Amino acid sequence: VYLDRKLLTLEDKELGTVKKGYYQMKKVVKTVAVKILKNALKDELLAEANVMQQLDNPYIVRMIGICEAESWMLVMEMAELGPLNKYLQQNRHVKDKNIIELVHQVSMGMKYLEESNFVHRDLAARNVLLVTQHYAKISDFGLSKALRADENYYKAQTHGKWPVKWYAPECINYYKFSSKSDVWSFGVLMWEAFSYGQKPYRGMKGSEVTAMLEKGERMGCPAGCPREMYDLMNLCWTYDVENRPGFAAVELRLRNYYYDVVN
Numbered sequence: 316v317y318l319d320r321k322l323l324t325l326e327d328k329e330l331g332t333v334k335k336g337y338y339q340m341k342k343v344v345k346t347v348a349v350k351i352l353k354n355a356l357k358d359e360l361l362a363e364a365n366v367m368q369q370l371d372n373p374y375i376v377r378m379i380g381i382c383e384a385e386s387w388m389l390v391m392e393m394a395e396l397g398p399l400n401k402y403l404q405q406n407r408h409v410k411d412k413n414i415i416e417l418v419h420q421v422s423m424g425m426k427y428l429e430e431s432n433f434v435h436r437d438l439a440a441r442n443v444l445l446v447t448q449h450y451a452k453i454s455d456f457g458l459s460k461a462l463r464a465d466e467n468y469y470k471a472q473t474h475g476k477w478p479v480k481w482y483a484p485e486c487i488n489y490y491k492f493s494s495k496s497d498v499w500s501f502g503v504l505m506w507e508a509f510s511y512g513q514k515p516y517r518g519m520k521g522s523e524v525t526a527m528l529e530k531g532e533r534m535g536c537p538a539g540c541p542r543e544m545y546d547l548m549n550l551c552w553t554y555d556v557e558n559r560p561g562f563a564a565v566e567l568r569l570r571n572y573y574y575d576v577v578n
């Protein structure tokens with residue numbers, strides 16, 4: 316849906332280009348985050364908007380619309396607390412239960428994405444945004460693909476701006492991206508979250524990570540991380556795609572554990 320520029324006010328400062336603004340609705344004004352294109356790069360923004368327009372889930376960032384003026388602009392709902400990794404780095408008092416809660420929410424959004432036959436392809440703590448300390452949304456659908464009705468993976472060709480530390484072995488070895496490869500990414504994300512925003516595989520190059528993983532080595536259990544959560548991380552890092560769980564199983568595992576903690 317195309318938006319009316321004269322109903323949009325932008326802040327002069329930027330968030331990272333992404334800027335805060337306000338979109339006049341009928342009686343209220345909605346605070347928005349606006350991705351603005353520095354003037355086939357057009358087509359990628361449109362691809363991203365095309366994916367977000369098909370998704371409707373509480374744990375996924377909503378698109379408001381696109382506004383063509385001066386620059387091209389993708390207008391989305393605002394998650395005020397920002398990226399998960401940054402938040403947790405600055406808020407080390409956040410408790411295990413809370414982290415469980417937030418990663419469970421991520422798993423619910425990913426369960427839905429899996430059901431909708433979309434692959435995210437850039438799932439990481441940086442692409443989970445906090446509306447509140449108890450409400451997480453998945454963002455950044457720029458690399459995301461809608462799977463064909465007759466296939467369970469997307470085959471890339473030699474993209475190189477790849478977040479290798481979040482990628483499953485089959486992505487690196489065969490360029491095959493599935494909901495199962497997103498599950499691998501989710502394991503890395505979980506590690507990141509329980510590590511309060513630390514980068515994974517610190518100081519390592521991509522090739523060294525691939526080598527570490529091929530030896531069967533995996534990142535260790537974060538300090539204070541419940542062992543059941545580390546076990547779930549290790550399960551996400553199943554080398555063999557076919558044996559690695561889907562998000563239905565991952566979400567169910569987190570759901571039960573979370574409500575075991577709540578009980």
Ligand SMILES: CS(=O)(=O)c1ccc(Nc2nc(N[C@H]3CCCC[C@@H]3N)nc3cc[nH]c(=O)c23)cc1
Nearest residue numbers: 330331333348391392393394395396397398441442
């Ligand atoms: C100043 S801060 O670090 O606390 C902060 C950073 C980003 C945001 N919000 C967003 N960021 C981004 N994109 C980037 C910005 C740079 C860091 C990684 C994010 N994925 N995309 C979107 C999309 C829709 N809605 C959003 O709110 C949004 C909010 C606060």
